[PDB]
């Protein structure tokens, strides 16, 4: 009924249960809310919505687990969450329909001769 045992929604539920402790421990109470954090983590899951292999799904869930305990054990601080999780999301939803009529090509043209590498 749900593809590959519904493991994506089970892992999403586990992370959503883990989330308020992350917000308290990393002191992100006045930076982001739990609703937008849940939406962001949901947006991390949709990027692999077209995986056709269950073993890739299991590996992705294992790797996402290891990411969530390295956030739980304070091995990455709040600035890591800022620079890796929520500002890429806000950049992907903030630049949409900008105040200028320049195409993405012309912004890339005026920036440099080559495409940007990384974030």
């Amino acid at each position: 009924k749900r593809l590959f045992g519904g493991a994506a929604r089970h892992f999403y539920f586990e992370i959503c249960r883990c989330l308020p402790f992350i917000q308290r421990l990393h002191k992100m109470e006045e930076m982001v809310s739990l609703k937008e954090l849940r939406a962001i983590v949901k947006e991390k899951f949709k990027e692999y919505k077209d995986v056709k292999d269950g073993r890739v799904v299991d590996l992705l869930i294992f790797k996402g687990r290891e990411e969530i305990e390295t956030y739980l054990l304070m091995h990455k601080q709040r600035h890591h969450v800022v620079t890796e999780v929520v500002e890429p999301y806000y950049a992907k939803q903030r630049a949409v329909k900008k105040v200028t009529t320049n195409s993405p090509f012309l912004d890339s043209f005026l920036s440099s001769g080559y495409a940007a590498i990384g974030v």
């Binding site: 590996l59 294992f62 290891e66 091995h75 990455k76 600035h79 620079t83 590498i117």
Partner: protein
Amino acid sequence: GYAYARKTTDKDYIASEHMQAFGNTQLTDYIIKTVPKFVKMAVTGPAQSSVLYQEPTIYTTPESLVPLMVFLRDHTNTQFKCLLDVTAVDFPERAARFEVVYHLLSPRWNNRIRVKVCVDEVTAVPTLCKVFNTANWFERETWDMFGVFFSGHPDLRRILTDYGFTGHPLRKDFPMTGYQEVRYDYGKKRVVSEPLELTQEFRYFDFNSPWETLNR
């Protein structure tokens, strides 16, 4: 638990003639004949123990790695009690690009052996934690460096790389210098990871002769 101190005199000998002859000559055929379904390929080559001998290499499937290792530990003629390491080698040209390699030492008869399993990136290898207690950290390192998943491990987590490190560095398609680098920011008052920039890029010297015959 073997090789207890028994002789109180100085020993000027290594092994006995019959057991050394059996180990250095007949062990490949013996392992193939006794447990044929476990063995898919064998190589007898230049001998981990010494420069003067030959020693076998056994290829097996992941479905029978644990029974073969239990047999090689507990059989009376092959008492391989010590597991020295677990590692992997990447062969990107193959359909299954990884070879997981197990080295063993027999203190009872001064022997060594090598055991190989071929898997790709998404096929799990059974853990040998219950057979050998050192298999834990070596499987953790192999998962860290190559991304080989060991099923049934108690706590498979990375052991060597950085805390947020995604990516398996010992693969052939991973760059030598990586993707990110680290510096201190005075404004954020934190040590921050940034995309890689090099003051002097790495110079790759291609030395290989177009007459050389040994390249395989």
